[PDB]
């Protein structure tokens with residue numbers, strides 16, 4: 001459901017930059033899409049979407065399908081690509097990326 005909030009071309013540039021099988025980075029991808037500077041409000045709303053299960057948290061499984069809201073079958077993480085997002089979005093090593101953690105990494109991307 002984040003397709004209406006964004007763009008379009010912004011999703012075609014980030015995915016075209018990481019479509020490879022292991023070329024995803026979390027900083028270059030989100031940096032191109034535009035979430036880096038969207039508005040903390042519409043950002044907490046972007047995360048609310050990343051939370052595919054409704055646990056106010058981004059779990060590793062969501063990280064794999066993190067691009068489903070932008071494309072139902074858009075990017076499909078390769079596993080190693082998921083080990084990058086998790087090791088780049090989790091610092092406390094809790095296995096869960098809350099908002100401040102998510103809106104902090106997405107904005108600093």
Ligand SMILES: [Ca+2]
Nearest residue numbers: 055057058059
């Ligand atoms: Ca979750």
Ligand SMILES: [Ca+2]
Nearest residue numbers: 090096097101
């Ligand atoms: Ca965390």
